[PDB]
Design a protein around this nucleic acid. Structure first.
Ligand code: MG
Ligand code: MG
Ligand code: MG
Length: 801
RNA sequence: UUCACAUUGCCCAAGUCUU
RNA sequence: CAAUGUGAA
C-alpha cells in the first residue's frame, strides 16, 4: 500500500512527433557536498531577513570560516567543500542594519548517489539530494528577485504594465529541479502576476479614488472615499530606512488627528521641521493596532515587491489577460529567450557547486495516439471520427435519446426583454435541433410563466411537481448573473429532486444551431439518455471483464479564505460503455487534500454500479485529480486503503484489482512542436493525442504526459498521469490508450477534453456543491453536509452536467 | 446560466518579525 | 465554478 510500481514498458502506439520541452539538461559533478544546520535567534524573522543575516554572517566571518555557501532561508546551509567544523557547533554573533547564529554539521550529500538513482543502479531517488540542488539553484534569485512559490518575479526593465488601482503586472519565471530518465533537468516556464507599484502613497490614493491629480480636492475625503482607500491600503507595507505595515487609516485629517506624547501635522512641524502639503488628508496607522503610530500620506511610499493577493477587478483582469496572452510559439520563444539571458552558469553559487545548465530546450519524441471512433444511434447508427480532437453531431442521433413528453418553462427574465415571441421562437428552434438529435420534444410545454425573484422559485417548482404527472424537465430562463440560479439548483437538486436546465436570456433571444445542439447534449444526459459510446470493438481489453471507472477531486476555497470547507467529489461509471456516471460529494476540513470519507463514497458507488449493471467490478480504475508530488504518499496511503476498505466491508474476499492514477493539469511542463508544419491552428499547439513517456518522465516509475485536447488559444497544458498503484499490471500502451479514449466520453461536448471524463465530472460535482453552499459557508459540519446532500430522486442522476 | 480551450483563484510550495 | 479572453455546426 506504498511503493509505486515500476514502469512496465514503454508505449509503442501512434505515429512519432518531434517535440521540445521546457526542461533544460543539467550536468552535476560526482562529489559530496556538506550539509549544516543553522539556528538564528530570534527565529521569528521572515525568510528573506534570515537570508540577509546569513549573507552578512558569511562576509563578516570570511577569515577562519567560509574564506560560497548556499542557504534555504531557514535552517539548511550547504557548501561545496567542508568547513573548519567537525560536528562541533559554532556560536556566531552577527550584526546588521543583533542576532546569534548557531551552526551544526549534519551530513554529507553525495551527488554520486544521485547519478546512480538516475540510472537503474539505485531503487529510488534520494529526496535530500534533490533538495540540496534546489537550494543551490534558488540561492541567488531568492535575494535578487521576489520569490512567489517556486517562481521569481521582478519589475521588467524598460516597460510598465499598469493595471490601475496602484497595481501593475510583474513578469517572472518558475524554476524547479527534476530527475528524469535522461539527466537532472531544470524546468523553467515564464509567468506574470500582479504587484503593487512602488509609488508615493499620495499617488496610490489618486489611482484608487480615480483622481487625475491630488488637489481635486483640498477638502477631506468623504467617508465613502475614505473607506474605499482604507480597504485598499490596509495590510500593505509602506516606507518612510523604515518599513511598516498599515493597520488602519485615521478618520480625522493630519491637521486634526491627535496622539499623546498633539496633532500629527504639528508633531511633524516641530520635530521634523516638515510643513505638510495636504493637511486635510488622513494619516496611515502603522505597526501595532493598539498603539498610536500615525504617518501622514505625504511621507510614505508603498514598498517595492509586494504581490497583490486580493482579487483583480474585471477591468484589471482584462488588462492582465491582454498583457500576458501568448501563442505556443510565442511562449516557446519567451522561455528560450529567458534562458539565454538568465545565464545560470555564471551564477557564482551554481558555479561554486560545479553545475552546468544547457541553454537549449530538451528534444523529446512524442507519439500521437489514434482517437477512438464514436458510435451514435437512431436508425443510421452513425460513426463519428475525431479529427484534431473535434467532431460534431450533424446528421447523427443519440445512442439512446430521451423522448420528452412533459416539460415546462419558467422565465425569470423580464417580459419586456424576453418576450413571448422570443420564448416561442426559442422553443421552435430547440425542438427542431432536438428532433435532429434523436431527442424529440413532442409538443409545447405544459406550463410557461414569467416569475421574478428568488422567492418565487420554490413555490413555482412545488406547484409544477404537484400538478404535472410525468414532468421530465423545467427549462429556466435567466436574465444574466443572478442569485436565482443558485436558488433553482438548491430547490431542483436538493429540496425537490427535479431536472432543471438553465439558459441565459441572450441565448433565447438569439439562437444558433451550435448552442442549441450543445444544450441538447446536456438535456439528454440529465434525463437519463446516452449521447454516444466508444466504438465497442475499438476499446482496450480491460473492458472484457466488469470494470468501474472512478474520478475524484477536492476543490479548496479561494486565496485568503480562512473558514470555508474543502469539497471532495467522487464519481463512478455505471455502465460498460462507459458513459453514464453517478456522483458522491462531501464537505471536509478546510484545505485538506486527502478525501476523508472516501471509503463510504466508494461503497455507495459500488452498490449503484451493481444495481445498474448486475456485475461486481473485477477492476477499479481510480483517476485522482490534482495531487502534487509532495503529497503522493500521504494521499495514496489513506485513499488506497479506503478503496480496499469499501470492498472488504461489502463482501468476502471481494478484492478487485485497483489502479490508482494521479492526474495533474496544473504543473509547469510545456511541450512544443519542433517542426513548424506540425503546429495546429492559430495557437500553434501540439495535436490532440500527443503522448510523452520518455526522456523527461520519471527515472523508475510509471508516468506519462498526454495532451488529449485540441489547443484553441495560448499554450496547451499537457495533462500528466502518474500511476501510484497498479494491481492490474497495465502495459503503457493499454493505459495510455484507455486514458485517451476516456477523454472522448465527456457528454457536454463533441470534443476530446483535457482530462478523462470521470475526473472532469468530479470537478463539476464539486463546483455544484460550492453553488449549493453560497453564503452558507460538529453542528457546523452537519449544517454544511446537509446543504450539499442531493434529493433521493437526484442521487442516481447526472444532475451536475 | 450552450460548450471547450486559455490566464488567475485550490494540496505541496510560497507567505508571516518614535507617533 | 467565478472574473477575462479565444473560439465552435
Ligand atoms: Mg482539486
Ligand atoms: Mg505549507
Ligand atoms: Mg468563463
Amino acid at each position: 500500500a506504498f511503493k509505486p510500481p515500476p514502469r512496465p514498458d514503454f508505449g509503442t502506439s501512434g505515429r512519432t512527433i518531434k517535440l521540445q520541452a521546457n526542461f533544460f539538461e543539467m550536468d552535476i559533478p560526482k562529489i559530496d557536498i556538506y550539509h549544516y544546520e543553522l539556528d538564528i535567534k530570534p527565529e521569528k524573522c521572515p525568510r528573506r531577513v534570515n537570508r540577509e543575516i546569513v549573507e552578512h554572517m558569511v562576509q563578516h566571518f570570511k577569515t577562519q570560516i567560509f574564506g560560497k555557501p548556499v542557504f534555504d532561508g531557514r535552517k539548511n546551509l550547504y557548501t561545496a567543500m567542508p568547513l573548519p567544523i567537525g560536528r562541533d557547533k559554532v556560536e556566531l554573533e552577527v550584526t546588521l542594519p543583533i542576532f546569534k547564529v548557531s551552526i551544526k554539521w549534519v551530513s554529507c550529500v553525495s551527488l554520486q548517489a544521485l547519478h546512480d538513482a538516475l540510472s537503474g543502479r539505485l531503487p529510488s531517488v534520494p529526496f535530500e539530494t534533490i533538495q540540496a540542488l534546489d537550494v543551490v539553484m534558488r540561492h541567488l534569485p531568492s535575494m535578487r528577485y521576489t520569490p512567489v512559490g517556486r517562481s521569481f518575479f521582478t519589475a521588467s526593465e524598460g516597460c510598465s504594465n499598469p493595471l490601475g488601482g496602484g497595481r501593475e503586472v510583474w513578469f517572472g519565471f518558475h524554476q524547479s529541479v527534476r530527475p528524469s530518465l535522461w539527466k537532472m533537468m531544470l524546468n523553467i516556464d515564464v509567468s506574470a502576476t500582479a504587484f503593487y507599484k512602488a509609488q508615493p502613497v499620495i499617488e496610490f490614493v489618486c489611482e484608487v479614488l480615480d483622481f487625475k491629480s491630488i488637489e481635486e480636492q483640498q477638502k477631506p475625503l468623504t467617508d465613502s472615499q475614505r473607506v474605499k482607500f482604507t480597504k485598499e491600503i490596509k495590510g500593505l507595507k509602506v516606507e518612510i530606512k523604515r518599513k511598516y505595515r498599515v493597520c488602519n487609516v485615521t478618520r480625522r485629517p493630519a491637521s486634526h488627528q491627535t496622539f499623546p506624547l498633539c496633532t500629527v501635522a504639528q508633531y511633524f512641524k516641530d520635530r521634523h521641521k516638515l510643513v505638510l502639503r495636504y493637511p486635510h488628508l488622513p494619516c496611515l496607522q502603522v505597526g501595532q493596532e493598539q498603539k498610536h503610530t500615525y504617518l501622514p500620506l505625504e511621507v510614505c511610499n508603498i514598498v517595492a515587491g509586494q504581490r497583490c493577493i486580493k482579487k483583480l477587478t474585471d477591468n484589471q483582469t482584462s488588462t492582465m489577460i491582454r498583457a500576458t496572452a501568448r501563442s505556443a510559439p510565442d511562449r516557446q520563444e519567451e522561455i528560450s529567450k529567458l534562458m539565454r539571458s538568465a545565464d545560470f552558469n555564471t551564477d557564482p553559487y551554481v558555479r561554486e557547486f560545479g553545475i552546468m545548465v544547457k541553454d537549449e530546450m530538451t528534444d523529446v519524441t512524442g507519439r500521437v495516439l489514434q482517437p477512438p471512433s464514436i458510435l451514435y444511434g437512431g436508425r443510421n447508427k452513425a460513426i463519428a471520427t475525431p479529427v484534431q480532437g473535434v467532431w460534431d453531431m450533424r446528421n447523427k442521433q443519440f445512442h439512446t435519446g430521451i423522448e420528452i413528453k412533459v416539460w415546462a418553462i419558467a422565465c425569470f427574465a423580464p417580459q419586456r426583454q424576453c418576450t413571448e415571441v422570443h420564448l416561442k421562437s426559442f422553443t421552435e428552434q430547440l425542438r427542431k435541433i432536438s428532433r435532429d438529435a434523436g431527442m424529440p420534444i413532442q409538443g409545447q410545454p405544459c406550463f410557461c410563466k414569467y416569475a421574478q425573484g428568488a422567492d418565487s422559485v420554490e413555490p413555482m417548482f412545488r406547484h409544477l411537481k404537484n400538478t404535472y404527472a410525468g414532468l421530465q424537465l423545467v427549462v429556466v430562463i435567466l436574465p444574466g448573473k443572478t442569485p436565482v440560479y443558485a436558488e433553482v439548483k438548491r430547490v431542483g437538486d436538493t429540496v425537490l429532486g427535479m431536472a432543471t436546465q438553465c439558459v441565459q436570456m441572450k441565448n433565447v433571444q438569439r439562437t444558433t444551431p451550435q448552442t442549441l445542439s450543445n444544450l441538447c447534449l446536456k438535456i439528454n444526459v440529465k434525463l437519463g439518455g446516452v449521447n454516444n459510446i466508444l466504438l465497442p470493438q475499438g476499446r482496450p481489453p480491460v473492458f472484457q471483464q466488469p470494470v468501474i471507472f472512478l474520478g475524484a477531486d477536492v476543490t479548496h476555497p479561494p486565496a485568503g479564505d480562512g473558514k470555508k470547507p474543502s469539497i471532495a467529489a467522487v464519481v463512478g461509471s455505471m455502465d460498460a460503455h462507459p458513459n453514464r456516471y453517478c456522483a458522491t460529494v462531501r464537505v471536509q476540513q478546510h484545505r485538506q487534500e486527502i478525501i476523508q470519507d472516501l471509503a463510504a463514497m466508494v461503497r455507495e458507488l459500488l452498490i449503484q454500479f451493481y444495481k445498474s449493471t448486475r456485475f461486481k467490478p473485477t477492476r477499479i480504475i481510480f483517476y485522482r485529480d490534482g495531487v502534487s508530488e509532495g503529497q503522493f504518499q500521504q494521499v495514496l496511503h489513506h485513499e488506497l486503503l479506503a478503496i480496499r476498505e469499501a470492498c472488504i466491508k461489502l463482501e468476502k474476499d471481494y478484492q478487485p484489482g485497483i489502479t490508482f492514477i494521479v492526474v495533474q493539469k496544473r504543473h509547469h511542463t510545456r511541450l512544443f512542436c519542433t517542426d513548424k508544419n506540425e503546429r495546429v491552428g492559430k495557437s500553434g499547439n501540439i495535436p490532440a493525442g500527443t503522448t510523452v513517456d520518455t526522456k523527461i518522465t520519471h527515472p523508475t516509475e510509471f508516468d506519462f504526459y498526454l495532451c488529449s485536447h485540441a489547443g484553441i488559444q495560448g499554450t496547451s497544458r499537457p495533462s500528466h498521469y502518474h500511476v501510484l498503484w497498479d494491481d492490474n499490471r497495465f502495459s503503457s500502451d493499454e493505459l495510455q490508450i484507455l486514458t485517451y479514449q476516456l477523454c472522448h466520453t465527456y457528454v457536454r461536448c463533441t470534443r476530446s477534453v483535457s482530462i478523462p471524463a470521470p475526473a472532469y465530472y468530479a470537478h463539476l460535482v464539486a463546483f455544484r456543491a460550492r453553488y449549493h453552499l453560497v453564503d452558507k459557508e460538529g453542528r457546523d459540519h452537519q449544517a454544511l453536509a446537509k446543504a450539499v446532500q442531493v434529493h433521493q430522486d437526484t442521487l442516481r442522476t447526472m444532475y451536475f452536467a
